[PDB]
Amino acid sequence: MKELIYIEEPKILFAHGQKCTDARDGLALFGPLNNLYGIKSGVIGTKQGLKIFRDYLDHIQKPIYNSNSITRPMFPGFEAVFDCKWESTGITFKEVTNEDIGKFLYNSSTHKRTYDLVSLFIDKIISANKNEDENVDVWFVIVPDEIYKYCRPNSVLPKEMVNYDAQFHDQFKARLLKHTIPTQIFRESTLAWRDFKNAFGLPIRDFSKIEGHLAWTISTAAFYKAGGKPWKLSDVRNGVCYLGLVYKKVEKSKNPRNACCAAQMFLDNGDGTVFKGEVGPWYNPKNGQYHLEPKEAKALLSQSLQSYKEQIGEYPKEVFIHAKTRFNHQEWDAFLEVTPKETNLVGVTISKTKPLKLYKTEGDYTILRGNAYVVNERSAFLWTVGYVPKIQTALSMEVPNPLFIEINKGEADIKQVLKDILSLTKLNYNACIFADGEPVTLRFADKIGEILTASTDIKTPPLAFKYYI
Amino acid sequence: NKIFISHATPDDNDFTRWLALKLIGLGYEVWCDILFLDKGVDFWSNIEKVIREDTCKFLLVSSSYSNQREGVLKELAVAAKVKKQLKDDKFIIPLAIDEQLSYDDINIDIVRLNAIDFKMSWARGLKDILEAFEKQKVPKEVADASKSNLLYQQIFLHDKSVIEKEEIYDSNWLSILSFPEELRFHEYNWMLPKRFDVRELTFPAVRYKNYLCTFAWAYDFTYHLPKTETYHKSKTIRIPTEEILSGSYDSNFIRNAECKRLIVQLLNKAFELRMKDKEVQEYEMSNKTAYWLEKGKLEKDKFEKTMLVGKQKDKNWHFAISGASKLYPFPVLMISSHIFFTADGKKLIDSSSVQHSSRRRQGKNWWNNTWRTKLLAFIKYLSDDDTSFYLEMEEKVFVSNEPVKFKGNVSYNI
RNA sequence: UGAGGUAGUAGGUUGUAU
DNA sequence: ATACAACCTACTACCT
Numbered sequence A: 001m002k003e004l005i006y007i008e009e010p011k012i013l014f015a016h017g018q019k020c021t022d023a024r025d026g027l028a029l030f031g032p033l034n035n036l037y038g039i040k041s042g043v044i045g046t047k048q049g050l051k052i053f054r055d056y057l058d059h060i061q062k063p064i065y066n067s068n069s070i071t072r073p074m075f076p077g078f079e080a081v082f083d084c085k086w087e088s089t090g091i092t093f094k095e096v097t098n099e100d101i102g103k104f105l106y107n108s109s110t111h112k113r114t115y116d117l118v119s120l121f122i123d124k125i126i127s128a129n130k131n132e133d134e135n136v137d138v139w140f141v142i143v144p145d146e147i148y149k150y151c152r153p154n155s156v157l158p159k160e161m162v163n164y165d166a167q168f169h170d171q172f173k174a175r176l177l178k179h180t181i182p183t184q185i186f187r188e189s190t191l192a193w194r195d196f197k198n199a200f201g202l203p204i205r206d207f208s209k210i211e212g213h214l215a216w217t218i219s220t221a222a223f224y225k226a227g228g229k230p231w232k233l234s235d236v237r238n239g240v241c242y243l244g245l246v247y248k249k250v251e252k253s254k255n256p257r258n259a260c261c262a263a264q265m266f267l268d269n270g271d272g273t274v275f276k277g278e279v280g281p282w283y284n285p286k287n288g289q290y291h292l293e294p295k296e297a298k299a300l301l302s303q304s305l306q307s308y309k310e311q312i313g314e315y316p317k318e319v320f321i322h323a324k325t326r327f328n329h330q331e332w333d334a335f336l337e338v339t340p341k342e343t344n345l346v347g348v349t350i351s352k353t354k355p356l357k358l359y360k361t362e363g364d365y366t367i368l369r370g371n372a373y374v375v376n377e378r379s380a381f382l383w384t385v386g387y388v389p390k391i392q393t394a395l396s397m398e399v400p401n402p403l404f405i406e407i408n409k410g411e412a413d414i415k416q417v418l419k420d421i422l423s424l425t426k427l428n429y430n431a432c433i434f435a436d437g438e439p440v441t442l443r444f445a446d447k448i449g450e451i452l453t454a455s456t457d458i459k460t461p462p463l464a465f466k467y468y469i
Numbered sequence B: 001n002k003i004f005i006s007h008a009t010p011d012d013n014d015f016t017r018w019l020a021l022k023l024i025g026l027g028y029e030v031w032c033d034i035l036f037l038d039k040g041v042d043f044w045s046n047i048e049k050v051i052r053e054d055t056c057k058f059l060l061v062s063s064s065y066s067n068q069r070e071g072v073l074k075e076l077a078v079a080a081k082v083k084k085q086l087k088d089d090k091f092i093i094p095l096a097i098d099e100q101l102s103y104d105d106i107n108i109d110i111v112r113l114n115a116i117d118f119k120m121s122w123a124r125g126l127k128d129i130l131e132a133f134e135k136q137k138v139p140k141e142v143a144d145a146s147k148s149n150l151l152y153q154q155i156f157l158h159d160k161s162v163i164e165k166e167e168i169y170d171s172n173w174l175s176i177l178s179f180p181e182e183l184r185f186h187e188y189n190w191m192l193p194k195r196f197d198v199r200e201l202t203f204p205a206v207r208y209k210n211y212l213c214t215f216a217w218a219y220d221f222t223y224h225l226p227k228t229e230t231y232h233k234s235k236t237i238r239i240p241t242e243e244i245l246s247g248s249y250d251s252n253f254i255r256n257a258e259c260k261r262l263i264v265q266l267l268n269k270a271f272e273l274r275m276k277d278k279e280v281q282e283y284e285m286s287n288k289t290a291y292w293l294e295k296g297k298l299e300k301d302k303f304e305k306t307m308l309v310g311k312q313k314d315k316n317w318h319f320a321i322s323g324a325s326k327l328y329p330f331p332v333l334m335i336s337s338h339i340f341f342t343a344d345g346k347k348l349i350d351s352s353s354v355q356h357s358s359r360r361r362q363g364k365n366w367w368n369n370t371w372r373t374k375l376l377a378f379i380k381y382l383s384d385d386d387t388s389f390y391l392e393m394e395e396k397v398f399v400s401n402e403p404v405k406f407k408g409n410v411s412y413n414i
Numbered sequence C: 001u002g003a004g005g006u007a008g009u010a011g012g013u014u015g016u017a018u
Numbered sequence D: 001a002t003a004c005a006a007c008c009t010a011c012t013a014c015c016t
């Protein structure tokens, strides 16, 4: 006998100032906010990879359908959506020979092979960036499936064919940060899933019914990396800054340390959205402790406030901090020693470790998305993942898990916090889907941290997201 | 001044909706049979009246489905007659959108006409349409995407919204209805190393500084601790549990949080002992323990006609639940569902990878109703009376076998 | 590593008080 | 260094 409140689905804004609930429908209807003239693409890989990428680029121009056009909207083609040309005629190839991959891939040490392959790719990319006249917006790296299989941290090479992190993606994106090259990594089995079949004569990955969804996600990621704005939030307040704090364990360092990384979300004076990472991962040397020291917390808050002031010109009225952990007294005391008296500091803990599953008794479908169970004035549950009436299906697979949102520190209306989190679940530029589960601040801070802790050290890293996602 | 779009109704709907909404957003009056959610009595007569009296252009969606469709052909003939009447050569503008239809297999009605190619690119085709409309002086208004958004909301989304309706959900929380009157700290001093095993005793007991936090009587431990036969009841600290749950205890003897944690530990230990007493099989996870049943222990594995044990491909799958106890926000027992696999009826698989793969394979086709029914069936199986089930704590703890129901004021229409 | 979701497996920390 | 609860990350495998 308890009451669940409902939070209306937030609306995102598109071209012509038109609001919509679905990113795909809004893009196919009105278009992106930006005006890109075209995407000039550089391709790195074998000749087979270049052929696969050319075939996919020619395929993506034509409309692509899903099995059901209500559950999954169909792709009407790249130029029919984004109003810009992304063709195979603007491709700037850079060949990586198969013997080059064979020389480095087959090694007893996984670290050495990962370093060698990453160096082989990035050296060509950097040389083409510096010593060529052609302009490249995004560099597409068509990695063969063997590299992906054998370059994971826990991968073991069978004896039949026999610092930095032993991961191809993280090391590749971390060693390319000093040059600010937005790059997109594809696997050959992704763009040509038909040709990679198992012993049963069927493709290992089946994209027959979700081809349009794959095209949507790939096109949105490529458009965002080239410098486009697909959509933005529409129903958020003014004078409020959203933060995020994610801790990642650093393994390259001899002493285990915890690096805290942030993502900052707010609005500018031109009604646009400013969403970029707050970086320089602040280090806690004590293993197993996920709380910042007072000086690190002071530096973090000072940097965030300085960025906000330099962007707008006035200190934020409110600052919301989202984290998967719980702030202690020292962290918050350090935080209050820097923020001005006019600024309100709220520290919210968002977790997904509370197993409260709600089962609907009148069908085979799950609980509606957006339903919230307010435990008290400082604790509530939110169903960010669940049945969505628009797509006539649920974002989960069996039964969704709830997001336990608790206002750890400060004073705020928990209804407003739930509204903010549900709105932030609509800003994932890495994919073209409906709203996701995690807030975008936490997810993108995690994405940044996964890369900034995959190298020994790095100078002041870029704030832009196209260099990480 | 209208623009008529003729198409196969259920087959060419995606392109027709796209083009109609794009043209509406650009300032054109578009007449399409999908832009009307409610259809009137007079359809064909109204269609002919629209073609003869209203439209200034006739866009035909030329595809494989629309090649020899009776309605499309009838509209084509009426449009040809209208074009002859108005002495306009370019009244009918076909749109080639299907790659399966060759340019030599188009019907007689449009075999002589200059078409617009949408096969390679929809954007190029739309640009061609707009250029032709501008060149031929087709009437239009000022561009306004708000009209397109409004039409999309009205027609293509009216049956896909949230309706206000009472809904009842069943959770996985079993509220603890009755609690023991009080908690006892038994200061037994040494008591022969105070039963060093601790966790192996019949009754749930934990070791404090020099005390023993229990809910049962002191003599109950005489079976495992003979010395406690001479233990005196005078060394007992009584503490009121109902007052503890309200956060009333203070002072330096013990903290309220410590009391709540100790109560949680006692409840979890008691639950483990009761489940061990219920003759059920146990599986050790990475951080918890789950309880499952065997092949033929139920007749016939259809408790309340819900099924608990089944046959996937070559192994027998058994339902399971794992439990804990929490005081946040109110005293509840919190259980979670799991699926385990055995090679035979009474066996187990030591390979964790195959267990994970089989669990993921089976989770794909179960859904909320089967999940809830199996959870409720297991809970009812563990029940001991009409509307509860008890666990040993003389003293005992009763937990309801009916999960707490939540109520919402919004829902959907399946 | 197109992207989410759901699970499983390891490890560590914290006020305790043996 | 044991037991416990209460919070934390890293790393896979599978479905769509």
Ligand SMILES: [Mg+2]
Pocket (backbone or CB within 6 Å): A221, A430, A469
């Ligand atoms: Mg990406």
